Short mmCIF file of C-alpha atoms in Angstrom, two decimals:
data_model
loop_
_atom_site.label_atom_id
_atom_site.label_comp_id
_atom_site.label_asym_id
_atom_site.label_seq_id
_atom_site.Cartn_x
_atom_site.Cartn_y
_atom_site.Cartn_z
CA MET A 1 0.00 0.00 0.00
CA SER A 2 1.08 3.62 0.59
CA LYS A 3 1.31 6.19 3.39
CA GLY A 4 -1.22 8.39 1.59
CA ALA A 5 -3.84 5.64 1.61
CA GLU A 6 -4.04 5.95 5.41
CA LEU A 7 -5.66 9.37 4.94
CA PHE A 8 -8.72 7.72 3.40
CA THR A 9 -9.75 5.09 5.97
CA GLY A 10 -12.56 7.29 7.28
CA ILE A 11 -14.99 9.83 5.82
CA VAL A 12 -13.16 12.74 4.18
CA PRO A 13 -14.75 16.16 3.44
CA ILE A 14 -14.41 17.36 -0.15
CA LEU A 15 -14.37 20.83 -1.77
CA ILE A 16 -14.52 21.34 -5.53
CA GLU A 17 -14.09 24.60 -7.50
CA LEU A 18 -14.38 24.86 -11.28
CA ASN A 19 -14.05 27.80 -13.68
CA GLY A 20 -15.23 26.99 -17.20
CA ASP A 21 -15.40 28.73 -20.56
CA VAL A 22 -17.20 26.82 -23.34
CA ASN A 23 -17.49 28.56 -26.72
CA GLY A 24 -16.99 31.81 -24.80
CA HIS A 25 -19.72 31.10 -22.20
CA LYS A 26 -18.13 31.52 -18.78
CA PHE A 27 -19.38 29.87 -15.62
CA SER A 28 -18.19 28.75 -12.21
CA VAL A 29 -19.22 25.78 -10.10
CA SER A 30 -18.63 25.06 -6.41
CA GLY A 31 -19.14 21.65 -4.83
CA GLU A 32 -18.97 20.12 -1.39
CA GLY A 33 -19.58 16.72 0.14
CA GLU A 34 -17.73 13.69 1.42
CA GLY A 35 -15.98 10.54 0.29
CA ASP A 36 -15.77 7.04 1.74
CA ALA A 37 -12.96 5.19 -0.03
CA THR A 38 -13.41 2.07 2.09
CA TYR A 39 -16.65 1.40 0.17
CA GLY A 40 -15.90 3.49 -2.93
CA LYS A 41 -18.74 5.97 -2.33
CA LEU A 42 -18.97 9.72 -2.94
CA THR A 43 -21.77 12.19 -2.31
CA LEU A 44 -21.46 15.75 -3.63
CA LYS A 45 -23.64 18.81 -4.10
CA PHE A 46 -22.70 21.28 -6.86
CA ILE A 47 -24.00 24.84 -7.38
CA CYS A 48 -23.49 27.02 -10.43
CA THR A 49 -22.26 30.11 -8.58
CA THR A 50 -22.53 32.39 -11.62
CA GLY A 51 -26.25 31.75 -12.20
CA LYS A 52 -27.59 29.39 -14.87
CA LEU A 53 -25.17 26.75 -16.13
CA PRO A 54 -24.82 27.21 -19.97
CA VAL A 55 -24.00 23.51 -20.70
CA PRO A 56 -25.62 20.31 -19.46
CA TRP A 57 -24.61 19.17 -15.98
CA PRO A 58 -23.78 15.66 -17.34
CA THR A 59 -20.96 17.11 -19.46
CA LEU A 60 -19.15 18.26 -16.29
CA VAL A 61 -19.44 15.09 -14.21
CA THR A 62 -16.06 13.60 -15.09
CA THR A 63 -14.25 16.92 -14.62
CA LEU A 64 -15.84 17.65 -11.25
CA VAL A 66 -11.50 12.80 -7.24
CA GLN A 67 -10.48 9.24 -8.12
CA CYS A 68 -8.58 8.97 -4.85
CA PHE A 69 -11.99 7.90 -3.42
CA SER A 70 -12.04 4.63 -5.38
CA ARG A 71 -12.26 1.40 -3.42
CA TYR A 72 -9.13 -0.61 -4.09
CA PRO A 73 -9.61 -4.19 -2.84
CA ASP A 74 -6.87 -5.34 -0.47
CA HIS A 75 -5.14 -7.46 -3.10
CA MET A 76 -4.93 -4.44 -5.41
CA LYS A 77 -3.73 -1.79 -2.99
CA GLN A 78 -0.29 -1.74 -4.62
CA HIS A 79 -1.95 -0.27 -7.73
CA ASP A 80 -3.54 2.83 -6.17
CA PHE A 81 -1.59 5.76 -7.60
CA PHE A 82 -4.17 8.34 -6.56
CA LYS A 83 -3.95 7.87 -2.79
CA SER A 84 -0.19 7.32 -2.90
CA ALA A 85 0.28 10.87 -4.20
CA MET A 86 -1.50 12.33 -1.14
CA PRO A 87 -1.42 14.56 0.78
CA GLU A 88 0.73 16.62 -1.64
CA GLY A 89 -1.61 15.65 -4.45
CA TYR A 90 -1.62 15.31 -8.19
CA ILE A 91 -2.26 17.29 -11.34
CA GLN A 92 -5.04 15.79 -13.48
CA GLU A 93 -5.20 16.89 -17.12
CA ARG A 94 -7.74 15.83 -19.75
CA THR A 95 -8.87 16.29 -23.27
CA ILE A 96 -12.45 15.14 -23.93
CA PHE A 97 -13.76 14.74 -27.50
CA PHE A 98 -17.55 14.83 -27.86
CA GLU A 99 -18.69 12.69 -30.80
CA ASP A 100 -19.43 14.88 -33.87
CA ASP A 101 -19.00 17.99 -31.73
CA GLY A 102 -16.46 20.04 -29.75
CA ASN A 103 -13.93 19.28 -27.08
CA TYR A 104 -13.15 20.09 -23.48
CA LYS A 105 -9.64 20.57 -22.08
CA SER A 106 -9.11 20.64 -18.32
CA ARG A 107 -6.35 20.98 -15.77
CA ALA A 108 -6.99 20.30 -12.09
CA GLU A 109 -5.00 20.18 -8.88
CA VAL A 110 -6.22 17.61 -6.35
CA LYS A 111 -4.65 17.74 -2.88
CA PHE A 112 -5.31 18.01 0.84
CA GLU A 113 -5.70 21.37 2.50
CA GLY A 114 -5.90 20.55 6.19
CA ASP A 115 -8.53 17.81 6.62
CA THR A 116 -10.22 18.53 3.29
CA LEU A 117 -9.59 16.98 -0.09
CA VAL A 118 -9.76 19.83 -2.62
CA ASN A 119 -10.16 19.66 -6.42
CA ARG A 120 -9.59 23.00 -8.25
CA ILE A 121 -10.18 22.94 -12.00
CA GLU A 122 -9.83 25.16 -15.04
CA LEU A 123 -11.85 24.01 -18.09
CA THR A 124 -12.01 25.32 -21.67
CA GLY A 125 -14.40 24.07 -24.34
CA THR A 126 -14.15 24.92 -28.01
CA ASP A 127 -15.59 24.09 -31.42
CA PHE A 128 -19.08 23.20 -30.16
CA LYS A 129 -22.05 23.29 -32.51
CA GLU A 130 -24.73 25.71 -31.39
CA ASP A 131 -27.38 23.11 -32.35
CA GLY A 132 -25.43 20.18 -30.94
CA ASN A 133 -26.35 18.30 -27.80
CA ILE A 134 -24.08 20.37 -25.51
CA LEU A 135 -24.86 24.00 -26.47
CA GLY A 136 -28.33 22.95 -27.59
CA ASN A 137 -28.89 21.28 -24.19
CA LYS A 138 -30.28 17.97 -25.57
CA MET A 139 -28.61 15.62 -23.06
CA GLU A 140 -30.77 13.77 -20.54
CA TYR A 141 -30.16 14.49 -16.86
CA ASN A 142 -28.70 11.09 -16.01
CA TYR A 143 -25.52 9.03 -16.05
CA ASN A 144 -24.36 5.51 -16.95
CA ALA A 145 -21.72 2.98 -15.82
CA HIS A 146 -18.20 3.09 -17.28
CA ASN A 147 -14.84 1.39 -17.08
CA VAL A 148 -11.88 3.74 -16.54
CA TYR A 149 -8.64 2.19 -17.87
CA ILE A 150 -5.38 3.00 -16.06
CA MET A 151 -1.76 2.34 -16.97
CA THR A 152 1.62 3.57 -15.81
CA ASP A 153 3.37 6.41 -17.63
CA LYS A 154 6.89 5.78 -16.36
CA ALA A 155 8.60 8.75 -18.02
CA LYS A 156 6.23 11.05 -16.11
CA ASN A 157 6.22 9.15 -12.80
CA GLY A 158 2.45 8.95 -13.11
CA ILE A 159 -0.43 7.41 -14.99
CA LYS A 160 -2.32 7.63 -18.27
CA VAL A 161 -6.04 7.00 -18.19
CA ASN A 162 -8.63 6.58 -20.94
CA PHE A 163 -12.32 5.81 -21.21
CA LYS A 164 -15.42 6.63 -23.23
CA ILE A 165 -18.51 8.11 -21.57
CA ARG A 166 -21.93 7.29 -22.99
CA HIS A 167 -24.29 10.28 -22.73
CA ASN A 168 -28.02 9.53 -23.21
CA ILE A 169 -29.64 12.03 -25.58
CA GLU A 170 -33.29 13.12 -25.49
CA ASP A 171 -34.10 11.42 -28.80
CA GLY A 172 -32.99 8.02 -27.43
CA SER A 173 -29.55 8.13 -29.08
CA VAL A 174 -26.20 7.93 -27.30
CA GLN A 175 -23.31 10.36 -27.74
CA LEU A 176 -19.80 9.30 -26.82
CA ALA A 177 -17.29 11.51 -25.02
CA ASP A 178 -13.80 10.12 -25.49
CA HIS A 179 -11.61 10.94 -22.46
CA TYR A 180 -7.79 11.04 -22.41
CA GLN A 181 -6.26 11.79 -19.06
CA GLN A 182 -2.85 12.09 -17.42
CA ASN A 183 -2.03 12.37 -13.71
CA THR A 184 1.32 13.52 -12.33
CA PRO A 185 2.34 13.85 -8.64
CA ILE A 186 2.78 17.28 -7.08
CA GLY A 187 5.10 16.04 -4.32
CA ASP A 188 8.57 14.51 -4.37
CA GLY A 189 7.76 11.31 -2.48
CA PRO A 190 7.51 7.85 -4.08
CA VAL A 191 4.21 6.94 -5.71
CA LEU A 192 2.64 3.65 -6.70
CA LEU A 193 2.93 3.02 -10.44
CA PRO A 194 0.22 0.48 -11.22
CA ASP A 195 -0.14 -2.54 -13.43
CA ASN A 196 -2.83 -2.05 -16.09
CA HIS A 197 -6.28 -2.21 -14.44
CA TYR A 198 -9.60 -0.39 -14.46
CA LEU A 199 -12.08 1.40 -12.22
CA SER A 200 -15.70 0.32 -12.44
CA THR A 201 -17.61 3.59 -12.05
CA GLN A 202 -21.38 4.06 -11.56
CA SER A 203 -23.21 7.33 -10.87
CA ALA A 204 -26.57 9.03 -10.48
CA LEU A 205 -27.60 12.67 -10.90
CA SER A 206 -30.42 14.08 -8.76
CA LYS A 207 -31.94 17.33 -7.46
CA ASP A 208 -33.03 18.77 -4.14
CA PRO A 209 -36.61 19.90 -4.78
CA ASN A 210 -36.13 22.72 -2.25
CA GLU A 211 -32.92 24.13 -3.82
CA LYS A 212 -33.75 27.02 -6.15
CA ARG A 213 -30.22 27.56 -7.49
CA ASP A 214 -28.99 25.67 -10.55
CA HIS A 215 -27.43 22.61 -8.96
CA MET A 216 -26.62 18.92 -9.14
CA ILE A 217 -26.80 16.33 -6.37
CA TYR A 218 -24.27 13.68 -7.36
CA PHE A 219 -23.75 10.09 -6.18
CA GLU A 220 -20.86 7.88 -7.28
CA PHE A 221 -19.75 4.33 -6.59
CA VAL A 222 -16.29 3.19 -7.74
CA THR A 223 -14.24 0.00 -7.29
CA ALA A 224 -10.93 -0.98 -8.87
CA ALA A 225 -10.72 -4.32 -10.67
CA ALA A 226 -8.11 -6.46 -12.41
CA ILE A 227 -8.11 -6.89 -16.17
CA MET B 1 -56.06 5.57 8.15
CA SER B 2 -53.30 6.94 5.90
CA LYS B 3 -53.67 6.08 2.21
CA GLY B 4 -52.11 6.64 -1.15
CA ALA B 5 -49.20 9.04 -1.37
CA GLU B 6 -49.66 9.92 2.33
CA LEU B 7 -47.87 6.65 3.11
CA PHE B 8 -44.68 7.84 1.38
CA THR B 9 -43.94 11.25 2.94
CA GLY B 10 -41.19 9.84 5.17
CA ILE B 11 -38.71 6.96 5.08
CA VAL B 12 -40.45 3.64 4.50
CA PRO B 13 -38.95 0.20 5.26
CA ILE B 14 -38.92 -2.23 2.31
CA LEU B 15 -38.91 -6.04 2.14
CA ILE B 16 -38.35 -7.92 -1.14
CA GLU B 17 -38.90 -11.68 -1.52
CA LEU B 18 -38.27 -13.53 -4.77
CA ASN B 19 -38.62 -17.22 -5.67
CA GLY B 20 -37.12 -18.01 -9.06
CA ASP B 21 -36.59 -20.93 -11.37
CA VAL B 22 -34.34 -20.29 -14.39
CA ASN B 23 -33.65 -23.10 -16.89
CA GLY B 24 -34.58 -25.43 -14.01
CA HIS B 25 -32.28 -23.79 -11.44
CA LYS B 26 -34.42 -22.90 -8.35
CA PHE B 27 -33.34 -20.07 -6.04
CA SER B 28 -34.59 -17.45 -3.61
CA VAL B 29 -33.56 -13.88 -2.86
CA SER B 30 -34.44 -11.70 0.12
CA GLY B 31 -33.93 -7.94 0.18
CA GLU B 32 -34.33 -5.27 2.87
CA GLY B 33 -33.80 -1.55 3.00
CA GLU B 34 -35.64 1.73 2.84
CA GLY B 35 -37.22 4.16 0.42
CA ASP B 36 -37.54 7.95 0.36
CA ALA B 37 -40.07 8.93 -2.29
CA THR B 38 -39.74 12.64 -1.47
CA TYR B 39 -36.30 12.53 -3.11
CA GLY B 40 -36.89 9.47 -5.32
CA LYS B 41 -34.23 7.35 -3.63
CA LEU B 42 -33.99 3.85 -2.26
CA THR B 43 -31.34 1.58 -0.88
CA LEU B 44 -31.58 -2.21 -0.62
CA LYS B 45 -29.39 -5.13 0.38
CA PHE B 46 -30.16 -8.45 -1.33
CA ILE B 47 -28.98 -11.92 -0.30
CA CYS B 48 -29.38 -15.19 -2.16
CA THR B 49 -30.91 -17.26 0.64
CA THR B 50 -30.48 -20.57 -1.18
CA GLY B 51 -26.70 -20.19 -1.53
CA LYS B 52 -25.16 -19.24 -4.86
CA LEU B 53 -27.30 -17.21 -7.28
CA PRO B 54 -27.54 -19.15 -10.61
CA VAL B 55 -27.86 -16.02 -12.79
CA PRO B 56 -26.03 -12.66 -12.72
CA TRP B 57 -27.35 -10.12 -10.21
CA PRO B 58 -27.85 -7.47 -12.95
CA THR B 59 -30.49 -9.66 -14.61
CA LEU B 60 -32.70 -9.46 -11.51
CA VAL B 61 -32.50 -5.70 -10.80
CA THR B 62 -35.73 -4.72 -12.56
CA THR B 63 -37.70 -7.60 -11.03
CA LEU B 64 -36.47 -6.91 -7.49
CA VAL B 66 -41.09 -0.91 -6.19
CA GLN B 67 -41.89 2.01 -8.48
CA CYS B 68 -44.07 3.54 -5.75
CA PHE B 69 -40.79 5.14 -4.52
CA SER B 70 -40.46 7.40 -7.56
CA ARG B 71 -40.40 11.15 -7.03
CA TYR B 72 -43.41 12.64 -8.83
CA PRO B 73 -42.95 16.44 -9.13
CA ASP B 74 -45.87 18.63 -8.01
CA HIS B 75 -47.13 19.15 -11.59
CA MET B 76 -47.40 15.37 -11.99
CA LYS B 77 -49.00 14.26 -8.72
CA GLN B 78 -52.26 13.35 -10.44
CA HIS B 79 -50.32 10.80 -12.52
CA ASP B 80 -48.84 8.57 -9.78
CA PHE B 81 -50.72 5.28 -10.17
CA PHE B 82 -48.29 3.35 -7.98
CA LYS B 83 -48.83 5.28 -4.73
CA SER B 84 -52.56 5.70 -5.39
CA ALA B 85 -53.06 1.93 -5.13
CA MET B 86 -51.63 1.82 -1.56
CA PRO B 87 -51.94 0.38 1.00
CA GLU B 88 -53.85 -2.48 -0.67
CA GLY B 89 -51.33 -2.49 -3.50
CA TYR B 90 -50.93 -3.67 -7.05
CA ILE B 91 -49.97 -6.70 -9.10
CA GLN B 92 -46.95 -6.17 -11.35
CA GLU B 93 -46.47 -8.64 -14.23
CA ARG B 94 -43.59 -8.71 -16.68
CA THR B 95 -42.15 -10.49 -19.66
CA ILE B 96 -38.46 -9.79 -20.32
CA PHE B 97 -36.52 -10.84 -23.44
CA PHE B 98 -32.71 -10.92 -23.34
CA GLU B 99 -31.39 -10.16 -26.84
CA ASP B 100 -30.29 -13.39 -28.62
CA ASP B 101 -30.95 -15.36 -25.44
CA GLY B 102 -33.67 -16.45 -22.99
CA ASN B 103 -36.60 -14.81 -21.26
CA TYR B 104 -37.97 -14.09 -17.79
CA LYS B 105 -41.65 -14.02 -16.79
CA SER B 106 -42.62 -12.60 -13.41
CA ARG B 107 -45.65 -11.88 -11.25
CA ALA B 108 -45.35 -9.77 -8.10
CA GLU B 109 -47.61 -8.34 -5.43
CA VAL B 110 -46.55 -4.94 -4.06
CA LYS B 111 -48.43 -3.80 -0.94
CA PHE B 112 -48.05 -2.69 2.65
CA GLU B 113 -47.72 -5.34 5.33
CA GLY B 114 -47.76 -3.37 8.55
CA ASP B 115 -45.57 -0.33 7.96
CA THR B 116 -43.33 -2.14 5.46
CA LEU B 117 -43.68 -1.92 1.69
CA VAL B 118 -43.39 -5.53 0.50
CA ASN B 119 -42.61 -6.80 -3.02
CA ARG B 120 -43.23 -10.56 -3.26
CA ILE B 121 -42.28 -12.09 -6.60
CA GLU B 122 -42.44 -15.36 -8.53
CA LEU B 123 -40.08 -15.58 -11.54
CA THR B 124 -39.56 -18.20 -14.25
CA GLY B 125 -36.78 -18.08 -16.83
CA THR B 126 -36.42 -20.27 -19.89
CA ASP B 127 -34.67 -20.63 -23.26
CA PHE B 128 -31.23 -19.52 -22.00
CA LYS B 129 -28.07 -20.55 -23.79
CA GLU B 130 -25.54 -22.46 -21.66
CA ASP B 131 -22.69 -20.26 -22.97
CA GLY B 132 -24.69 -17.03 -23.33
CA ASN B 133 -24.07 -13.95 -21.23
CA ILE B 134 -26.53 -14.98 -18.52
CA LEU B 135 -25.67 -18.62 -17.85
CA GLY B 136 -22.06 -17.95 -18.90
CA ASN B 137 -21.68 -15.12 -16.36
CA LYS B 138 -20.41 -12.51 -18.86
CA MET B 139 -22.43 -9.53 -17.63
CA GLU B 140 -20.54 -6.76 -15.87
CA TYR B 141 -21.53 -5.99 -12.27
CA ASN B 142 -22.96 -2.53 -12.97
CA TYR B 143 -26.07 -0.73 -14.13
CA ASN B 144 -27.06 2.14 -16.42
CA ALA B 145 -29.74 4.85 -16.68
CA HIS B 146 -33.11 4.10 -18.37
CA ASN B 147 -36.44 5.70 -19.20
CA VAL B 148 -39.48 3.68 -18.14
CA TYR B 149 -42.52 4.57 -20.31
CA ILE B 150 -45.97 4.52 -18.71
CA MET B 151 -49.47 4.81 -20.10
CA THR B 152 -52.96 4.04 -18.87
CA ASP B 153 -54.50 0.63 -19.56
CA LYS B 154 -58.16 1.61 -19.06
CA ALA B 155 -59.59 -1.88 -19.60
CA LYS B 156 -57.56 -3.20 -16.63
CA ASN B 157 -57.98 -0.07 -14.45
CA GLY B 158 -54.21 0.11 -14.45
CA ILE B 159 -51.11 0.87 -16.46
CA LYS B 160 -48.98 -0.58 -19.23
CA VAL B 161 -45.25 -0.01 -19.05
CA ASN B 162 -42.39 -0.62 -21.49
CA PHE B 163 -38.66 -0.07 -21.57
CA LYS B 164 -35.37 -1.63 -22.63
CA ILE B 165 -32.44 -2.20 -20.27
CA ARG B 166 -28.87 -1.87 -21.55
CA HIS B 167 -26.65 -4.49 -19.88
CA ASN B 168 -22.89 -3.94 -20.23
CA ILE B 169 -21.07 -7.14 -21.23
CA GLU B 170 -17.45 -7.99 -20.32
CA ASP B 171 -16.30 -7.72 -23.95
CA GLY B 172 -17.50 -4.11 -24.21
CA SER B 173 -20.75 -4.93 -26.01
CA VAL B 174 -24.25 -4.13 -24.78
CA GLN B 175 -27.07 -6.67 -24.48
CA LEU B 176 -30.63 -5.34 -24.47
CA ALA B 177 -33.38 -6.70 -22.23
CA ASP B 178 -36.81 -5.78 -23.66
CA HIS B 179 -39.38 -5.31 -20.86
CA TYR B 180 -43.17 -5.56 -21.14
CA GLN B 181 -45.03 -4.75 -17.94
CA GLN B 182 -48.58 -4.33 -16.65
CA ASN B 183 -49.83 -3.19 -13.24
CA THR B 184 -53.33 -3.55 -11.87
CA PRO B 185 -54.75 -2.63 -8.45
CA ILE B 186 -55.42 -5.37 -5.87
CA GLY B 187 -58.20 -3.38 -4.16
CA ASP B 188 -61.36 -1.74 -5.47
CA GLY B 189 -60.74 1.82 -4.29
CA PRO B 190 -60.10 4.80 -6.58
CA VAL B 191 -56.74 4.96 -8.37
CA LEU B 192 -54.98 7.53 -10.55
CA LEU B 193 -54.84 6.59 -14.25
CA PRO B 194 -51.98 8.65 -15.72
CA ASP B 195 -51.32 10.58 -18.86
CA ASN B 196 -48.41 9.14 -20.86
CA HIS B 197 -45.14 9.91 -19.08
CA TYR B 198 -41.87 8.26 -18.06
CA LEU B 199 -39.69 7.53 -15.06
CA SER B 200 -36.03 8.53 -15.32
CA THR B 201 -34.25 5.71 -13.46
CA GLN B 202 -30.57 5.53 -12.41
CA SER B 203 -28.89 2.83 -10.32
CA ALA B 204 -25.64 1.47 -8.94
CA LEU B 205 -24.64 -2.05 -7.83
CA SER B 206 -22.09 -2.50 -5.05
CA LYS B 207 -20.79 -5.03 -2.53
CA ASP B 208 -20.02 -5.05 1.17
CA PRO B 209 -16.41 -6.33 1.29
CA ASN B 210 -17.15 -7.99 4.65
CA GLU B 211 -20.31 -9.87 3.56
CA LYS B 212 -19.46 -13.49 2.66
CA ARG B 213 -22.88 -14.46 1.28
CA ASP B 214 -23.78 -13.98 -2.40
CA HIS B 215 -25.33 -10.51 -2.24
CA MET B 216 -25.98 -7.18 -3.92
CA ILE B 217 -26.02 -3.69 -2.40
CA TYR B 218 -28.36 -1.65 -4.58
CA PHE B 219 -28.92 2.11 -4.90
CA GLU B 220 -31.64 3.65 -7.06
CA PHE B 221 -32.74 7.19 -7.94
CA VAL B 222 -36.01 7.78 -9.82
CA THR B 223 -37.97 10.87 -10.90
CA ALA B 224 -41.09 11.06 -13.06
CA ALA B 225 -41.05 13.38 -16.05
CA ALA B 226 -43.56 14.62 -18.57
CA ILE B 227 -43.91 13.78 -22.23
#
């Protein structure tokens, strides 16, 4: 295992901050909640702090803390994410939406005191104004995905890839192809994993009494061998 | 005393009991947990009480209480499921697994004391020995689905249809085509809805310390207009 993994044996408070700019539409999101890595469970509430969110909430789910994955005991040697803590890691992505534009993101994920914090900058470009993102044609829901992880030795980190399936209001499915890299912030040794994946499942909900534009988010994640 | 949707304003205990026979393999499942219709959420723990389950857990998710859906204020007059309570409803299904066998089920959903009980009989047939079901090739996860509901006036009830997408270990998807009808057990007034759907999202998990064959199940459901 790792020293960093010891920070996740209980329930850890989470703070998330995102600034986004998609086809020139600027927005910010704040989130808070808690993670339980022993069972691979996360619960988060997000608010669009700038007013109305100009893209669908489902497009932001992957951008908005994989250190909360459950790694079974026999796989603990493969948990890069916790091993990088508390100093943290940089998480970078490019996301290609099928027949549409792309997102690029850079985040820093680290502890500040007792809290695990994820601070993100996101840019989206080349979206179609009548596509499913800017045209807001994505259903308010989420599916199950496998997140594939391998070591990137030259970078002392990992490369990650997966394809998200977004349900569209006409019954179709639009893919979002994710390419991700994570690099440690600190100088300490990290765990560089064998190839494996994270089984991820999620649900998007609302608080009927919350008048702000918001997302209540539930996630369940467990690592598995290939 | 309390009737209809009045029975669902708080947290309600749930009991699920299923007796199944699939390609001649007999088994039973018991589930317990709680539902919160105000937010459209439920949580259940299922155990195979006869030992090892002879089919994948994902195949049984839909069979194993749509009265826990959140109906928004503008749709309260369309909630058949709660309107039938406490006396309850019969739920019957036929389910076809693409290029494989079928399930047929009959359930009674009603209050027994303060518990909402779903008691089910299920028969499966025509499965392939090396198909995804009997060959155990279904991933342990679940996706988001729309459940379409209309009135069935002749039966004083509803007709329901949907298709489940089951993720398969090779990266394919196997569809399960569902045909469902619900009719009240009692003779009191019920709500016969306009056409609408339920947006359903779920996640399947495990308790690492539970040795029995089991499923921890989370569901989130909200009704929406068409």
